[PDB]
Short mmCIF file of C-alpha atoms in Angstrom, two decimals:
data_model
loop_
_atom_site.label_atom_id
_atom_site.label_comp_id
_atom_site.label_asym_id
_atom_site.label_seq_id
_atom_site.Cartn_x
_atom_site.Cartn_y
_atom_site.Cartn_z
CA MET A 772 0.00 0.00 0.00
CA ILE A 773 2.47 2.41 -1.13
CA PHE A 774 2.22 5.74 -2.77
CA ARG A 775 4.91 7.09 -4.94
CA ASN A 776 4.80 10.54 -6.22
CA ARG A 777 7.78 11.61 -8.18
CA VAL A 778 7.98 12.20 -11.68
CA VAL A 779 7.70 9.18 -13.83
CA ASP A 780 10.22 8.02 -16.41
CA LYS A 781 10.92 5.12 -18.46
CA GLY A 782 12.81 3.44 -15.86
CA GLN A 783 10.61 3.95 -13.00
CA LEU A 784 8.26 2.15 -14.98
CA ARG A 785 10.71 -0.37 -15.56
CA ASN A 786 11.65 -1.03 -12.16
CA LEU A 787 8.18 -0.40 -11.20
CA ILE A 788 6.87 -3.24 -12.93
CA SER A 789 9.55 -5.09 -11.43
CA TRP A 790 9.01 -4.42 -7.91
CA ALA A 791 5.42 -5.33 -8.42
CA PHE A 792 5.89 -8.73 -10.18
CA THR A 793 8.99 -9.32 -7.97
CA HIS A 794 6.42 -9.90 -5.17
CA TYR A 795 3.22 -10.45 -7.09
CA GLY A 796 1.95 -13.41 -9.07
CA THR A 797 3.25 -12.85 -12.65
CA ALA A 798 -0.13 -12.36 -14.42
CA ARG A 799 -1.58 -10.59 -11.32
CA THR A 800 1.07 -7.86 -11.95
CA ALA A 801 1.77 -8.56 -15.65
CA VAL A 802 -1.89 -7.48 -16.14
CA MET A 803 -0.98 -4.21 -14.29
CA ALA A 804 0.74 -1.41 -16.27
CA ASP A 805 -1.95 -2.12 -18.93
CA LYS A 806 -5.15 -0.27 -17.94
CA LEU A 807 -3.07 2.60 -16.48
CA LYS A 808 -0.73 1.89 -19.44
CA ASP A 809 -3.54 2.41 -22.03
CA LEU A 810 -4.41 5.37 -19.74
CA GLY A 811 -0.97 6.62 -20.70
CA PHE A 812 -2.75 7.16 -23.76
CA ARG A 813 -5.71 8.62 -23.05
CA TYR A 814 -4.10 11.17 -21.09
CA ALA A 815 -1.34 11.82 -23.20
CA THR A 816 -3.98 12.46 -25.54
CA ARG A 817 -5.50 14.90 -23.41
CA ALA A 818 -2.46 16.81 -22.84
CA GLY A 819 -1.80 16.23 -26.38
CA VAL A 820 1.36 17.24 -27.87
CA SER A 821 3.24 17.55 -30.97
CA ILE A 822 5.99 19.11 -32.82
CA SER A 823 6.21 22.49 -34.14
CA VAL A 824 8.48 23.35 -36.69
CA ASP A 825 10.79 25.38 -34.55
CA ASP A 826 10.05 22.76 -32.22
CA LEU A 827 13.30 22.32 -33.77
CA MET A 828 14.57 24.94 -31.48
CA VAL A 829 18.11 26.03 -31.85
CA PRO A 830 19.96 27.40 -28.79
CA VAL B 781 19.90 -47.01 -56.13
CA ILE B 782 17.07 -44.89 -54.71
CA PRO B 783 13.39 -45.97 -55.37
CA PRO B 784 11.64 -44.31 -58.41
CA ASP B 785 8.40 -42.82 -56.95
CA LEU B 786 10.61 -40.36 -55.00
CA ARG B 787 12.85 -39.01 -57.69
CA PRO B 788 9.94 -39.18 -59.51
CA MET B 789 8.95 -38.27 -62.96
CA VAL B 790 6.58 -35.21 -62.65
CA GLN B 791 3.34 -34.20 -64.42
CA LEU B 792 2.73 -31.20 -66.46
CA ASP B 793 0.50 -31.98 -69.44
CA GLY B 794 1.59 -30.62 -72.86
CA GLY B 795 4.77 -32.72 -73.19
CA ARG B 796 6.88 -30.68 -70.73
CA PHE B 797 6.94 -33.72 -68.34
CA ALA B 798 9.91 -32.61 -66.07
CA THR B 799 11.10 -36.12 -64.91
CA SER B 800 14.09 -35.57 -62.50
CA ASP B 801 17.89 -34.95 -62.08
CA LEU B 802 19.35 -38.20 -60.61
CA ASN B 803 17.56 -40.74 -62.85
CA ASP B 804 19.57 -38.99 -65.62
CA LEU B 805 22.62 -39.62 -63.51
CA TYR B 806 21.60 -43.03 -63.61
CA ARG B 807 20.87 -42.69 -67.15
CA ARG B 808 24.38 -42.18 -67.55
CA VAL B 809 25.49 -44.51 -65.24
CA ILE B 810 23.63 -47.64 -66.27
CA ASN B 811 24.57 -47.05 -69.96
CA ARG B 812 28.29 -46.47 -69.18
CA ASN B 813 27.98 -49.81 -67.28
CA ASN B 814 26.00 -51.96 -69.80
CA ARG B 815 27.43 -50.65 -73.13
CA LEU B 816 30.77 -51.37 -71.55
CA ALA B 817 30.26 -54.86 -70.59
CA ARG B 818 28.91 -55.12 -73.91
CA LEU B 819 32.27 -54.52 -74.93
CA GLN B 820 33.88 -56.97 -72.86
CA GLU B 821 32.85 -59.90 -74.67
CA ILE B 822 33.78 -58.75 -77.95
CA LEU B 823 36.94 -58.07 -76.32
CA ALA B 824 37.75 -55.48 -78.82
CA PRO B 825 40.60 -52.99 -77.99
CA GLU B 826 40.81 -51.48 -74.46
CA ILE B 827 40.98 -48.09 -76.29
CA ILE B 828 37.15 -48.50 -76.28
CA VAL B 829 37.04 -50.61 -73.06
CA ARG B 830 39.82 -49.65 -70.55
CA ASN B 831 39.12 -46.04 -71.67
CA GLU B 832 35.50 -46.47 -70.68
CA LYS B 833 36.37 -47.86 -67.32
CA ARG B 834 37.21 -44.19 -66.55
CA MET B 835 33.85 -43.26 -68.16
CA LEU B 836 32.60 -45.97 -65.73
CA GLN B 837 34.44 -44.83 -62.57
CA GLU B 838 33.03 -41.47 -63.84
CA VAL B 839 29.92 -42.65 -61.87
CA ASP B 840 31.62 -40.48 -59.19
CA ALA B 841 29.59 -37.65 -60.83
CA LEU B 842 26.39 -39.58 -59.95
CA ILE B 843 27.56 -39.31 -56.37
CA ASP B 844 28.59 -35.78 -56.78
CA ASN B 845 28.34 -33.74 -59.76
CA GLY B 846 30.98 -31.70 -58.36
CA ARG B 847 33.83 -32.81 -56.25
CA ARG B 848 36.38 -33.80 -58.61
CA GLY B 849 35.68 -33.89 -62.32
CA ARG B 850 34.21 -30.78 -63.69
CA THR B 851 30.72 -31.00 -62.96
CA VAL B 852 28.44 -32.24 -65.57
CA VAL B 853 26.01 -29.75 -67.01
CA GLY B 854 22.26 -29.35 -66.33
CA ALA B 855 19.44 -27.54 -68.19
CA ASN B 856 21.56 -24.44 -67.33
CA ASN B 857 24.98 -26.18 -66.94
CA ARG B 858 24.01 -26.48 -63.23
CA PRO B 859 25.84 -28.85 -60.81
CA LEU B 860 22.91 -31.25 -61.40
CA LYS B 861 22.00 -31.49 -57.92
CA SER B 862 23.76 -34.69 -57.05
CA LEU B 863 21.93 -37.39 -55.05
CA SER B 864 24.52 -36.21 -52.46
CA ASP B 865 23.18 -32.64 -53.01
CA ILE B 866 19.60 -33.14 -51.65
CA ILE B 867 20.11 -32.96 -47.81
CA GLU B 868 23.36 -30.96 -47.76
CA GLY B 869 22.86 -27.19 -47.64
CA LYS B 870 20.62 -25.29 -45.18
CA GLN B 871 18.32 -25.04 -48.25
CA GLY B 872 19.14 -28.71 -49.04
CA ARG B 873 16.27 -30.79 -47.54
CA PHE B 874 17.99 -32.28 -44.45
CA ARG B 875 17.36 -29.89 -41.51
CA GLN B 876 15.04 -27.51 -43.45
CA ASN B 877 13.08 -30.66 -44.53
CA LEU B 878 12.86 -31.88 -40.88
CA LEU B 879 14.40 -29.53 -38.26
CA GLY B 880 12.54 -26.77 -40.14
CA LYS B 881 9.68 -28.27 -42.13
CA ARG B 882 7.11 -25.97 -43.15
CA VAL B 883 3.95 -27.13 -41.57
CA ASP B 884 0.28 -26.73 -41.59
CA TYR B 885 -2.65 -25.25 -39.57
CA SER B 886 -1.96 -21.58 -38.70
CA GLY B 887 -2.32 -17.99 -40.05
CA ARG B 888 -0.04 -15.46 -41.82
CA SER B 889 -1.67 -12.00 -42.12
CA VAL B 890 -0.23 -8.44 -41.90
CA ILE B 891 0.09 -7.38 -38.22
CA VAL B 892 -1.28 -3.79 -38.41
CA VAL B 893 -1.53 -1.59 -35.27
CA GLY B 894 -4.46 -2.69 -33.06
CA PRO B 895 -3.79 -1.75 -29.41
CA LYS B 896 -7.51 -1.75 -28.53
CA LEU B 897 -7.48 -5.39 -27.23
CA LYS B 898 -5.64 -6.47 -24.03
CA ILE B 899 -2.18 -8.17 -23.91
CA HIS B 900 -2.63 -11.73 -22.53
CA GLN B 901 -4.92 -12.32 -25.56
CA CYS B 902 -4.49 -11.61 -29.33
CA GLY B 903 -7.15 -10.55 -31.89
CA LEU B 904 -7.90 -13.13 -34.62
CA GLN C 758 -11.85 -14.50 -13.35
CA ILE C 759 -11.77 -16.62 -16.46
CA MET C 760 -7.96 -17.17 -16.23
CA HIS C 761 -5.48 -14.93 -14.30
CA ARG C 762 -4.94 -15.98 -10.63
CA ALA C 763 -3.77 -19.29 -12.20
CA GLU C 764 -0.32 -17.63 -12.55
CA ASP C 765 0.56 -18.70 -8.96
CA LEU C 766 -0.53 -22.37 -8.57
CA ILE C 767 1.81 -23.64 -11.35
CA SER C 768 4.38 -20.99 -10.28
CA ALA C 769 4.49 -22.39 -6.71
CA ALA C 770 4.15 -26.22 -6.99
CA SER C 771 7.59 -27.87 -7.49
CA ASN C 772 8.41 -28.72 -11.15
CA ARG C 773 6.12 -26.53 -13.20
CA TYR C 774 6.19 -28.44 -16.39
CA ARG C 775 5.56 -31.28 -14.44
CA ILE C 776 2.49 -29.77 -13.29
CA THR C 777 1.28 -29.12 -16.69
CA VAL C 778 1.76 -32.49 -17.71
CA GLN C 779 -0.30 -33.92 -15.07
CA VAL C 780 -2.68 -31.35 -15.63
CA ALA C 781 -3.28 -32.57 -19.02
CA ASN C 782 -3.48 -35.83 -17.47
CA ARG C 783 -6.47 -34.68 -15.83
CA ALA C 784 -7.42 -33.09 -18.91
CA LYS C 785 -7.52 -35.86 -21.28
CA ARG C 786 -9.31 -38.07 -19.05
CA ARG C 787 -11.56 -35.63 -17.37
CA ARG C 788 -12.97 -34.86 -20.60
CA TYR C 789 -12.60 -38.32 -21.68
CA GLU C 790 -14.29 -39.89 -18.78
CA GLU C 791 -17.62 -38.36 -19.79
CA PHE C 792 -18.54 -38.14 -23.50
CA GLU C 793 -22.19 -37.34 -22.61
CA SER C 794 -21.79 -33.57 -23.27
CA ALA C 795 -22.05 -32.95 -19.48
CA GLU C 796 -22.19 -29.12 -19.61
CA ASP C 797 -19.70 -29.10 -16.73
CA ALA C 798 -17.40 -30.08 -19.65
CA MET C 799 -19.25 -27.73 -22.06
CA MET C 800 -16.23 -25.43 -21.46
CA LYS C 801 -12.66 -26.50 -22.40
CA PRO C 802 -11.34 -29.70 -20.71
CA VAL C 803 -8.30 -27.97 -19.38
CA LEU C 804 -9.63 -25.14 -17.72
CA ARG C 805 -11.61 -27.18 -15.50
CA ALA C 806 -8.76 -29.36 -15.16
CA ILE C 807 -7.00 -26.55 -13.81
CA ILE C 808 -9.26 -25.09 -11.59
CA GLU C 809 -10.41 -27.95 -9.70
CA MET C 810 -6.87 -28.47 -9.23
CA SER C 811 -6.67 -24.93 -8.21
CA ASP C 812 -9.27 -25.07 -5.63
CA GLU C 813 -8.03 -28.24 -4.37
CA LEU C 814 -4.66 -26.86 -4.38
CA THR C 815 -5.22 -25.22 -1.15
#
């Protein structure tokens, strides 16, 4: 029962998943990072994002 | 000598009946053998007998168009795939015809994006 | 669920394969035993196989 709050990254996924499955029945946790994963979407969606041109910014 | 049904003679109607590529080895080989003996008897000069014995030992080609005489020629001067050229390369029967048979019952369709479904299960 | 919490039984029961294999062994017969379309066996022969393992596997 364990809240984490930081930013997220790749890795902290990565690990994350780990630390879950590392103590949780494979499927039980393999199924996790899927609903919230597909929620990656729908958010990211909502924030939405994309290039510009000068997206290609040049310092 | 291998059985016939398996080197078989093939069927395309029209007269283009492909046959095979080792029965012709034979074709050689039997003739070089019989015609020869069929010298023996008449016991004519070895110039046509002892010289054929090489055209007889030449059966080596049957066993390999390719080690050690120049190979014999095929429809396209190919190394007429020797009987010892059927299960030899990765594409030569052998493993690919056993370790890697093709096989039946299954699907082969383009895998386009389709993330809607879950993971533990695929979408047929 | 249909199939999910079954990721532990096999996981924690000595030789896993081995499990499977028996499990089949169930399977095969515990379809086999009844060819009267018993709807218990209306579903796939394994999955039962499994489960009644499962819930005897306490």
